Curated annotation (Swiss-Prot), chains A, B:
Pathway annotation from the record: Nucleotide-sugar biosynthesis; UDP-N-acetyl-alpha-D-glucosamine biosynthesis; alpha-D-glucosamine 6-phosphate from D-fructose 6-phosphate: step 1/1
GO MF terms, alphabetically ordered: carbohydrate derivative binding; glutamine-fructose-6-phosphate transaminase (isomerizing) activity
Residues binding substrate, per UniProt: 60-61, 105-107, 110, 261
Gene that this sequence comes from: GFPT1
Organism: Homo sapiens
Protein name (Swiss-Prot/TrEMBL): Glutamine--fructose-6-phosphate aminotransferase [isomerizing] 1
Disease: Myasthenic syndrome, congenital, 12: A form of congenital myasthenic syndrome, a group of disorders characterized by failure of neuromuscular transmission, including pre-synaptic, synaptic, and post-synaptic disorders that are not of autoimmune origin. Clinical features are easy fatigability and muscle weakness. CMS12 is characterized by onset of proximal muscle weakness in the first decade. Individuals with this condition have a recognizable pattern of weakness of shoulder and pelvic girdle muscles, and sparing of ocular or facial muscles.
Catalytic reaction equation(s): D-fructose 6-phosphate + L-glutamine = D-glucosamine 6-phosphate + L-glutamate
Keyword rRNA-binding among record annotations: no
Top-level taxon of the source organism: Eukaryota
EC class: transferase
Subunit text: Homotetramer, may also exist as homodimers.
EC number(s) stated in the UniProt entry for this protein: 2.6.1.16
Length: 365, 365
């Protein structure tokens, strides 16, 4: 059952300390800093010989690709392209024999993702499935893959599977760079982060009541702009998607560096704005975005890290999440957005697990 | 002056038959199907030897890249990556010696685009400027370039420069494939399209009164979803941007193949929806998107081609544009969206040339 929770989605959000452990179970060894994804053991040397990584997906799975693009670029040193599967197909995207294509899919049955897989296979690319469903078409038809091991997810709006996909792609990245002397300190930083992550997720979930109060402030609103950049760009997209999915409010993710190029004309004292600002190398530029938003009379809610003394000092509405390594922080920063969507949906009387007009998996067309 | 027009933006929209001719002037010869961009004459063989095209830009210039990605892929057979300049920089995107990087910029001074240029130059990439401003930093600092020759554009919301950038990148694509026997019929198709385009733009502008009537139907609305896919994905993004820029309504471009993955939960009888449906190879899939929207009680306005008998027959609100070749159709289909933004802004009492919170060029940070 959902037993102890009124919805599957809330259960699944609160399961994230355990789902992240489950994803890393048998794969990461924190004593000797090894990571092994057995499903990729054979094919790994081959992947390192490939020239480009292409991540192909729909919906929240696509966001997990956007969330891990930078660390994949960093640690593989390969170009990484992230593609919405329907557009990838419409464009007859060039794929080559020495491309490695990843198919990210909770269900493993999404029609566009599966047809993208078949397209790449026809062109001789090495294909890799990252799914949550053993025995699924995408799991069966790829050359190799990783079962993210998040466990069954029933909520139509995906929560634990997003963060389990995120962790899976980070573990892949860690395997890819494991022969480089120069990257050993970076790998150890990230792995110590992964070790700490479950406890930090518990700490985020403890602010559920604060998020519920923010949802009471927002639930009459018709729009909200969610702004972030760099590692947190995916966080804003996925948070915007979540609020669309189950609340039906018109939430839009805005790349923070593009704010000044159009979206800022929507900012005034009446447009709700959520800004994500983390202490990574984009920090000063995000502070600049915040300053612009405030200068145009917006009253943003800011998601920042607990140790970010200056924005806590100088900003009235902050949702304070624990600090982690730059490339893992989005796992923490998305959770208040998952919870915000949840609580907004509840305030509005809407079904959180089975929203209108949506399906857990779109297997047709 | 703007003389005969009350705004620079309306003047600039109505100048598009002439700006497109100006862009192609001295470059396309319709008698012998040659295209020559002298600024690229020397460097062309070198570009053909490169391995990847990367288009880097902000705002509407970025949309022109999205609008031409597919035809560039098709005719160059090269991978093409399109990047928002601010994100490109934040990620420390891998660039290589045998990449060719294009910088699309009306002003040639946008800080993020210019810093992207400098980043690529440092990495030994061949750099190409596509700008509307002679003597600009991006024009001066690239290895070669094309002045799009649209003439001065004063409206902060870019209109003629979008369609002139679009045409410039198509002419580049035509140069790239000009030694291939197998592509000669395709090149001639596209060039006969470019020859016809100015007259077809006049025909679109003649429906200004119909668009003004649609703006009267929309101007109390707070949101609008603009949906398209394939070649028309850029058209929906740029139309959404235009409505944000000068009307301050919350318009969002939605990739039509992603509709079913979240945005469809926003559709009911009260959410305005504009769908773009063209008779290219995405047609049946767009009809499916339309059917879903109508099935969930939406009442969309559809932008379709005049000769699309079946959606004209079966859909009540259509904005009927002239038929062109698939890879040029977005030049026509964006124009009613430029005009819709214009007329909405006028109905709301807002300054169309100098909207709040925005600048013609963001040269700082
Ligand atoms: O992640 P996949 O099974 O390929 O599905 C892609 C998407 O399809 C459906 O729309 C779901 O409601 C989503 O939660 C999901 O992100
Ligand atoms: O096209 P560029 O000069 O690089 O400018 C990028 C953008 O900057 C400004 O925001 C303008 O208002 C836009 O119309 C434009 O698209």
């Amino acid at each position: 059952m959902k037993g102890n929770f009124s919805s599957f989605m809330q259960k699944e959000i609160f399961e994230q300390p355990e789902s992240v452990v489950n994803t890393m179970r048998g794969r990461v060894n924190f004593d000797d800093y090894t990571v092994n994804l057995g499903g990729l053991k054979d094919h790994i040397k081959e992947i390192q010989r490939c020239r480009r990584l292409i991540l192909i997906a729909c919906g929240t799975s696509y966001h997990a690709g956007v969330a891990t693009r930078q660390v994949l670029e960093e640690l593989t040193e390969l170009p990484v392209m992230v593609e919405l599967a329907s557009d990838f197909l419409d464009r007859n995207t060039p794929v080559f024999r020495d491309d490695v294509c990843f198919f990210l899919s909770q269900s493993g049955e999404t029609a566009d993702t599966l047809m993208g897989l078949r397209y790449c296979k026809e062109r001789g690319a090495l294909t890799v499935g990252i799914t949550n469903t053993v025995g699924s078409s995408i799991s069966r038809e790829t050359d190799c893959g990783v079962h993210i091991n998040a466990g069954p997810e029933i909520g139509v709006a995906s929560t634990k599977a997003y963060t389990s996909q995120f962790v899976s792609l980070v573990m892949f990245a860690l395997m890819m760079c494991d022969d480089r002397i120069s990257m050993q300190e970076r790998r150890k930083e990230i792995m110590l982060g992964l070790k700490r992550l479950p406890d930090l997720i518990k700490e985020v979930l403890s602010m559920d009541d604060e998020i519920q109060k923010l949802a009471t402030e927002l639930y009459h609103q018709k729009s909200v702009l969610i702004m972030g950049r760099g590692y947190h760009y995916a966080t804003c997209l996925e948070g915007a998607l979540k609020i669309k999915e189950i609340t039906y409010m018109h939430s839009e993710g805005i790349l923070a560096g593009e704010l000044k190029h159009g979206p800022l004309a929507l900012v005034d004292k009446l447009m709700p704005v959520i800004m994500i600002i983390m202490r990574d190398h984009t920090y000063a530029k995000c502070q600049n975005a915040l300053q612009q938003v405030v200068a145009r009379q917006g009253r943003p809610v800011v998601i920042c890290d607990k140790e970010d003394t200056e924005t806590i000092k100088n900003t009235k509405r902050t949702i304070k999440v624990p600090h982690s390594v730059d490339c893992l922080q989005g796992i923490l920063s998305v959770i208040p957005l998952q919870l915000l969507a949840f609580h907004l949906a509840v305030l509005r009387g809407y079904d959180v697990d089975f929203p209108r007009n949506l399906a857990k998996s779109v297997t047709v067309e």
